[PDB]
Amino acid sequence: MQLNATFYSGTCPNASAIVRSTIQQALQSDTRIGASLIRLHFHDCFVNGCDASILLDDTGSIQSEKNAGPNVNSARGFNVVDNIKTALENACPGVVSCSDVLALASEASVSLAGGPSWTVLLGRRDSLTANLAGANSSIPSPIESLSNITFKFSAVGLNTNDLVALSGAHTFGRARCGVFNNRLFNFSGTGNPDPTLNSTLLSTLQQLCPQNGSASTITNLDLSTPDAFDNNYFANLQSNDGLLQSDQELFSTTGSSTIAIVTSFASNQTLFFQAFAQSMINMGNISPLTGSNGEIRLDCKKVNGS
Ligand code: HEM
Ligand SMILES: [Ca+2]
Ligand SMILES: [Ca+2]
Protein backbone atom coordinates (compact mmCIF):
# COMPACT_ATOMS: atom_id res chain seq x y z
CA MET A 1 0.00 0.00 0.00
CA GLN A 2 1.61 3.19 -1.32
CA LEU A 3 0.99 6.77 -0.22
CA ASN A 4 -0.53 9.17 -2.78
CA ALA A 5 -1.60 12.80 -3.12
CA THR A 6 -5.26 12.29 -3.95
CA PHE A 7 -6.08 9.81 -1.17
CA TYR A 8 -8.74 12.05 0.44
CA SER A 9 -9.71 13.62 -2.88
CA GLY A 10 -13.20 12.09 -2.89
CA THR A 11 -13.90 12.21 0.85
CA CYS A 12 -12.29 15.48 2.03
CA PRO A 13 -11.74 17.62 -1.10
CA ASN A 14 -10.83 20.75 0.86
CA ALA A 15 -8.60 19.13 3.49
CA SER A 16 -5.52 21.02 2.27
CA ALA A 17 -7.56 24.23 2.56
CA ILE A 18 -8.88 23.62 6.07
CA VAL A 19 -5.40 22.84 7.37
CA ARG A 20 -3.86 25.91 5.75
CA SER A 21 -6.69 28.13 6.96
CA THR A 22 -6.48 26.98 10.58
CA ILE A 23 -2.72 27.41 10.85
CA GLN A 24 -2.85 30.87 9.26
CA GLN A 25 -5.16 31.82 12.13
CA ALA A 26 -2.95 30.30 14.81
CA LEU A 27 -0.15 32.30 13.18
CA GLN A 28 -2.02 35.42 14.27
CA SER A 29 -1.21 34.82 17.92
CA ASP A 30 1.96 32.75 17.49
CA THR A 31 4.51 33.39 14.71
CA ARG A 32 6.44 30.52 16.21
CA ILE A 33 3.70 27.90 15.65
CA GLY A 34 4.80 27.40 12.05
CA ALA A 35 8.19 26.06 13.07
CA SER A 36 6.70 24.11 15.98
CA LEU A 37 4.33 22.02 13.91
CA ILE A 38 6.93 21.01 11.31
CA ARG A 39 9.28 19.85 14.07
CA LEU A 40 6.54 17.55 15.46
CA HIS A 41 6.29 15.88 12.04
CA PHE A 42 10.08 15.56 12.14
CA HIS A 43 10.02 13.91 15.60
CA ASP A 44 7.13 11.70 14.53
CA CYS A 45 8.76 10.22 11.46
CA PHE A 46 12.09 9.50 13.13
CA VAL A 47 10.36 7.24 15.67
CA ASN A 48 8.41 4.19 14.51
CA GLY A 49 7.81 5.95 11.22
CA CYS A 50 5.31 8.73 10.65
CA ASP A 51 2.47 7.29 12.71
CA ALA A 52 1.37 10.24 14.87
CA SER A 53 2.53 8.25 17.92
CA ILE A 54 4.18 11.40 19.27
CA LEU A 55 0.69 12.85 19.75
CA LEU A 56 -0.58 10.13 22.10
CA ASP A 57 -0.72 11.10 25.80
CA ASP A 58 0.19 9.04 28.88
CA THR A 59 -2.36 6.44 29.97
CA GLY A 60 -2.02 3.37 32.15
CA SER A 61 -0.45 1.48 29.25
CA ILE A 62 0.78 4.24 26.93
CA GLN A 63 4.13 5.82 27.88
CA SER A 64 3.82 9.11 26.01
CA GLU A 65 6.69 10.10 23.70
CA LYS A 66 6.09 13.68 24.83
CA ASN A 67 8.51 12.82 27.68
CA ALA A 68 11.60 11.72 25.75
CA GLY A 69 14.58 14.04 26.11
CA PRO A 70 13.97 15.76 22.74
CA ASN A 71 10.31 16.51 23.51
CA VAL A 72 10.18 17.31 27.21
CA ASN A 73 10.08 21.10 27.68
CA SER A 74 10.65 21.51 23.98
CA ALA A 75 7.88 20.03 21.81
CA ARG A 76 4.85 22.29 21.38
CA GLY A 77 1.75 23.09 19.36
CA PHE A 78 -0.35 20.07 20.28
CA ASN A 79 -3.34 22.29 21.03
CA VAL A 80 -3.15 23.66 17.47
CA VAL A 81 -2.92 20.11 16.07
CA ASP A 82 -6.24 19.50 17.80
CA ASN A 83 -7.75 22.67 16.29
CA ILE A 84 -6.68 21.42 12.86
CA LYS A 85 -8.09 17.96 13.62
CA THR A 86 -11.41 19.47 14.80
CA ALA A 87 -11.90 21.58 11.70
CA LEU A 88 -11.19 18.49 9.63
CA GLU A 89 -13.60 16.50 11.82
CA ASN A 90 -16.50 18.89 11.17
CA ALA A 91 -15.90 19.15 7.45
CA CYS A 92 -14.88 15.50 7.12
CA PRO A 93 -16.03 13.15 9.96
CA GLY A 94 -13.63 10.30 10.83
CA VAL A 95 -11.74 10.77 7.52
CA VAL A 96 -8.34 12.45 7.96
CA SER A 97 -5.70 10.68 10.11
CA CYS A 98 -3.48 12.52 12.56
CA SER A 99 -0.42 11.19 10.73
CA ASP A 100 -1.50 12.86 7.51
CA VAL A 101 -2.52 15.89 9.60
CA LEU A 102 1.08 16.48 10.66
CA ALA A 103 2.26 15.87 7.08
CA LEU A 104 -0.25 18.41 5.73
CA ALA A 105 0.53 20.91 8.49
CA SER A 106 4.26 20.79 7.72
CA GLU A 107 3.67 21.81 4.10
CA ALA A 108 1.23 24.57 5.07
CA SER A 109 3.59 25.93 7.71
CA VAL A 110 6.58 26.13 5.35
CA SER A 111 4.30 27.57 2.69
CA LEU A 112 2.83 30.40 4.76
CA ALA A 113 6.34 31.21 6.05
CA GLY A 114 7.30 32.15 2.50
CA GLY A 115 8.79 28.76 1.63
CA PRO A 116 8.18 26.15 -1.11
CA SER A 117 5.06 24.09 -1.75
CA TRP A 118 4.87 20.46 -2.69
CA THR A 119 2.42 17.71 -3.50
CA VAL A 120 1.85 16.13 -0.09
CA LEU A 121 1.50 12.34 -0.09
CA LEU A 122 -1.42 11.14 2.02
CA GLY A 123 -2.77 7.83 3.29
CA ARG A 124 -0.94 7.35 6.60
CA ARG A 125 -2.84 5.71 9.46
CA ASP A 126 -2.47 6.49 13.20
CA SER A 127 -0.51 4.21 15.54
CA LEU A 128 -1.89 2.40 18.60
CA THR A 129 1.25 2.79 20.72
CA ALA A 130 4.07 5.23 21.52
CA ASN A 131 7.83 4.69 21.77
CA LEU A 132 9.53 6.75 24.50
CA ALA A 133 12.76 4.73 24.49
CA GLY A 134 13.08 4.89 20.71
CA ALA A 135 12.56 8.63 20.85
CA ASN A 136 15.59 8.85 23.15
CA SER A 137 17.86 6.83 20.87
CA SER A 138 16.60 7.71 17.37
CA ILE A 139 16.39 11.49 17.41
CA PRO A 140 19.77 13.27 16.95
CA SER A 141 21.15 15.76 19.51
CA PRO A 142 22.59 19.22 18.68
CA ILE A 143 25.86 18.31 20.41
CA GLU A 144 26.37 15.03 18.56
CA SER A 145 29.11 14.74 15.95
CA LEU A 146 28.27 15.36 12.28
CA SER A 147 29.21 11.69 11.96
CA ASN A 148 26.90 10.51 14.70
CA ILE A 149 24.13 12.72 13.37
CA THR A 150 24.61 11.45 9.82
CA PHE A 151 24.27 7.89 11.10
CA LYS A 152 20.91 8.42 12.81
CA PHE A 153 19.66 9.90 9.56
CA SER A 154 20.77 6.78 7.64
CA ALA A 155 18.98 4.65 10.19
CA VAL A 156 15.60 6.12 9.19
CA GLY A 157 16.35 6.32 5.48
CA LEU A 158 17.70 9.82 4.81
CA ASN A 159 21.10 10.59 3.25
CA THR A 160 23.58 13.50 3.49
CA ASN A 161 21.67 15.51 0.90
CA ASP A 162 18.45 14.99 2.88
CA LEU A 163 20.40 15.95 6.02
CA VAL A 164 21.75 19.34 4.95
CA ALA A 165 18.51 20.25 3.21
CA LEU A 166 16.22 19.31 6.11
CA SER A 167 18.57 21.12 8.50
CA GLY A 168 17.46 24.28 6.72
CA ALA A 169 14.14 24.04 8.55
CA HIS A 170 16.12 25.90 11.18
CA THR A 171 15.74 28.99 8.99
CA PHE A 172 13.00 29.94 11.45
CA GLY A 173 11.91 28.87 14.93
CA ARG A 174 13.37 28.99 18.42
CA ALA A 175 15.95 27.14 20.54
CA ARG A 176 16.64 27.38 24.27
CA CYS A 177 19.92 28.23 26.05
CA GLY A 178 20.30 24.68 27.38
CA VAL A 179 20.75 23.23 23.89
CA PHE A 180 23.81 25.30 22.92
CA ASN A 181 25.23 27.07 25.96
CA ASN A 182 27.89 24.35 25.99
CA ARG A 183 29.66 26.39 23.28
CA LEU A 184 29.49 29.67 25.19
CA PHE A 185 32.04 29.35 28.00
CA ASN A 186 33.94 26.07 28.21
CA PHE A 187 33.49 24.09 25.01
CA SER A 188 34.37 20.38 25.44
CA GLY A 189 36.54 21.04 28.49
CA THR A 190 39.04 23.27 26.69
CA GLY A 191 38.59 26.32 28.89
CA ASN A 192 37.35 28.43 25.98
CA PRO A 193 34.24 28.95 23.86
CA ASP A 194 33.55 27.04 20.64
CA PRO A 195 35.96 28.64 18.14
CA THR A 196 33.61 27.95 15.20
CA LEU A 197 31.12 30.40 16.75
CA ASN A 198 31.37 34.03 15.52
CA SER A 199 32.90 36.36 18.12
CA THR A 200 30.21 39.06 17.88
CA LEU A 201 27.41 36.52 18.34
CA LEU A 202 29.17 34.67 21.17
CA SER A 203 29.11 37.79 23.34
CA THR A 204 25.36 38.35 22.77
CA LEU A 205 24.69 34.75 23.79
CA GLN A 206 26.95 34.84 26.86
CA GLN A 207 24.69 37.60 28.11
CA LEU A 208 21.48 35.91 26.97
CA CYS A 209 22.62 32.69 28.63
CA PRO A 210 24.74 33.42 31.72
CA GLN A 211 26.43 30.41 33.33
CA ASN A 212 24.03 30.58 36.28
CA GLY A 213 20.94 31.90 34.52
CA SER A 214 17.91 29.98 33.23
CA ALA A 215 18.63 27.22 30.74
CA SER A 216 15.19 27.72 29.21
CA THR A 217 15.64 31.24 27.83
CA ILE A 218 15.02 31.14 24.07
CA THR A 219 16.40 32.84 20.99
CA ASN A 220 15.99 32.46 17.23
CA LEU A 221 17.61 29.67 15.28
CA ASP A 222 18.10 32.22 12.49
CA LEU A 223 19.25 35.63 13.72
CA SER A 224 18.77 36.86 10.14
CA THR A 225 15.05 36.31 9.59
CA PRO A 226 13.64 34.49 12.66
CA ASP A 227 10.24 33.69 11.11
CA ALA A 228 10.74 33.75 7.32
CA PHE A 229 11.41 30.45 5.55
CA ASP A 230 14.35 31.37 3.32
CA ASN A 231 17.86 30.18 2.60
CA ASN A 232 19.47 32.48 5.17
CA TYR A 233 20.09 29.57 7.55
CA PHE A 234 22.97 28.62 5.23
CA ALA A 235 24.24 32.15 4.72
CA ASN A 236 24.50 32.32 8.51
CA LEU A 237 26.62 29.18 8.67
CA GLN A 238 29.17 30.78 6.35
CA SER A 239 29.58 33.70 8.78
CA ASN A 240 29.81 31.27 11.72
CA ASP A 241 26.44 32.42 12.99
CA GLY A 242 25.03 28.93 13.24
CA LEU A 243 23.34 28.68 16.64
CA LEU A 244 23.27 24.94 17.29
CA GLN A 245 26.56 23.04 17.33
CA SER A 246 24.93 20.64 14.88
CA ASP A 247 24.22 23.60 12.63
CA GLN A 248 27.73 24.97 12.33
CA GLU A 249 29.16 21.45 12.05
CA LEU A 250 27.49 21.30 8.61
CA PHE A 251 29.84 23.99 7.37
CA SER A 252 32.82 24.29 9.75
CA THR A 253 33.91 20.62 9.71
CA THR A 254 36.80 20.87 7.25
CA GLY A 255 36.92 18.16 4.58
CA SER A 256 33.22 17.32 4.75
CA SER A 257 30.94 16.95 1.71
CA THR A 258 28.24 18.90 3.51
CA ILE A 259 30.21 22.09 2.85
CA ALA A 260 29.40 22.21 -0.87
CA ILE A 261 25.74 21.50 -0.20
CA VAL A 262 25.64 24.34 2.31
CA THR A 263 27.45 26.79 0.03
CA SER A 264 25.07 25.68 -2.72
CA PHE A 265 21.93 26.43 -0.72
CA ALA A 266 23.30 29.71 0.58
CA SER A 267 24.17 30.58 -3.04
CA ASN A 268 20.84 29.73 -4.69
CA GLN A 269 17.47 29.67 -2.90
CA THR A 270 15.71 27.78 -5.71
CA LEU A 271 18.01 24.82 -5.26
CA PHE A 272 17.49 24.78 -1.51
CA PHE A 273 13.72 24.90 -1.89
CA GLN A 274 13.72 22.11 -4.45
CA ALA A 275 16.00 19.91 -2.38
CA PHE A 276 14.06 20.74 0.81
CA ALA A 277 10.65 20.03 -0.74
CA GLN A 278 12.16 16.79 -2.01
CA SER A 279 13.67 15.74 1.32
CA MET A 280 10.32 16.54 2.95
CA ILE A 281 8.45 14.01 0.86
CA ASN A 282 11.22 11.50 1.60
CA MET A 283 10.90 11.93 5.37
CA GLY A 284 7.14 11.67 5.05
CA ASN A 285 7.59 8.31 3.36
CA ILE A 286 9.24 6.62 6.37
CA SER A 287 7.55 3.50 7.86
CA PRO A 288 3.91 4.54 7.33
CA LEU A 289 0.93 2.49 8.57
CA THR A 290 -1.46 1.80 5.69
CA GLY A 291 -4.34 -0.48 4.74
CA SER A 292 -5.68 -2.34 7.76
CA ASN A 293 -2.80 -1.18 9.97
CA GLY A 294 -3.28 1.44 12.65
CA GLU A 295 -6.48 3.49 12.67
CA ILE A 296 -7.87 6.96 12.15
CA ARG A 297 -8.01 8.73 15.53
CA LEU A 298 -10.99 10.97 16.16
CA ASP A 299 -8.88 12.68 18.83
CA CYS A 300 -5.14 12.82 18.17
CA LYS A 301 -4.24 12.61 21.90
CA LYS A 302 -5.59 9.11 22.39
CA VAL A 303 -6.59 5.88 20.67
CA ASN A 304 -10.27 5.40 19.82
CA GLY A 305 -12.38 3.52 22.34
CA SER A 306 -10.30 5.06 25.13
C1 HEM B 1 19.83 17.24 11.99
C2 HEM B 1 19.55 17.26 13.42
C3 HEM B 1 18.82 18.22 14.11
C4 HEM B 1 19.10 18.63 15.39
C5 HEM B 1 20.34 18.31 16.20
C6 HEM B 1 18.02 19.47 15.80
C7 HEM B 1 17.93 20.06 17.05
C8 HEM B 1 16.96 20.98 17.42
C9 HEM B 1 16.92 21.61 18.73
C10 HEM B 1 17.79 21.30 19.96
C11 HEM B 1 15.91 22.52 18.67
C12 HEM B 1 15.58 23.41 19.85
C13 HEM B 1 14.59 22.80 20.81
C14 HEM B 1 14.54 23.53 22.12
O15 HEM B 1 15.50 24.27 22.43
O16 HEM B 1 13.55 23.36 22.86
C17 HEM B 1 15.33 22.46 17.34
C18 HEM B 1 14.31 23.26 16.86
C19 HEM B 1 13.71 23.14 15.63
N20 HEM B 1 13.99 22.14 14.74
FE21 HEM B 1 15.53 20.88 14.76
N22 HEM B 1 17.10 19.68 14.78
C23 HEM B 1 17.55 18.87 13.74
C24 HEM B 1 16.79 18.66 12.55
C25 HEM B 1 15.54 19.19 12.24
C26 HEM B 1 14.73 18.84 11.12
C27 HEM B 1 15.08 17.72 10.17
C28 HEM B 1 13.59 19.59 11.13
C29 HEM B 1 12.45 19.54 10.32
C30 HEM B 1 12.37 19.20 8.92
C31 HEM B 1 13.74 20.42 12.29
C32 HEM B 1 12.87 21.45 12.63
C33 HEM B 1 13.02 22.29 13.74
C34 HEM B 1 12.28 23.50 13.91
C35 HEM B 1 11.39 24.16 12.87
C36 HEM B 1 12.66 24.00 15.12
C37 HEM B 1 12.03 25.18 15.83
C38 HEM B 1 10.84 24.68 16.61
C39 HEM B 1 10.27 25.74 17.53
O40 HEM B 1 10.73 26.90 17.45
O41 HEM B 1 9.37 25.41 18.32
N42 HEM B 1 14.91 20.14 12.99
N43 HEM B 1 15.97 21.48 16.58
CA1 LIG C 1 6.49 8.49 15.52
CA1 LIG D 1 14.91 32.59 7.97
> Which residue lies with its CA nearest to atom 12 of ligand 1?
175
Give the 3-state secondary structure of residue 16.
helix
**Cα of 162 vs its chain's centroid, Å:** 13
Experimental method: X-ray
Residues 163 and 87: their CA atoms lie apart, in Å, by 33
Is it true that domain 3-139+284-304 has CATH number 3.30.70.20? no
Distance CA 119, CA 277 (A): 9
φ and ψ at residue 24, rounded to 5 degrees: -55, -20
State how far the Cα of 2 lies from the Cα of 290, in Å rounded to an integer.
8
What DSSP element (H or E) covers 218?
A: strand 218-220
The pocket of ion ligand 3, defined by CB under 5 A, consists of 171-172, 222, 225, 228, 230, 232
Domain ranges (residues) in the chain: 3-139+284-304, 140-283
Catalytic residue IDs: 43
Q: Which amino acid would we find at residue 2?
A: Q
Closest protein CA for atom 6 of ligand 1: 142
Sign of CA dihedral 112, 117, 123, 127: negative
| Data resolution in angstroms | 3.0
Do 206 and 199 touch, CB atoms closer than 8 A? Answer: no
In this structure, the residue with its CA closest to atom 38 of ligand 1 is 36
- CATH of 140-283 given 1.10.472.50, 3.40.120.10, 1.10.10.60, 1.10.420.10: 1.10.420.10
| Residues whose CB is less than 8 angstroms from the CB of residue 180 and which lie 6 or more positions away in sequence, other chains included | 142, 205, 209, 243, 244, 245
3-class state of residue 246 by DSSP: helix
Q: Give residue ranges with CB within 6 A of ligand 1.
A: 32, 35-36, 38-39, 42, 74, 76, 140-142, 149, 166-167, 169-170, 173-176, 179, 221, 244, 246
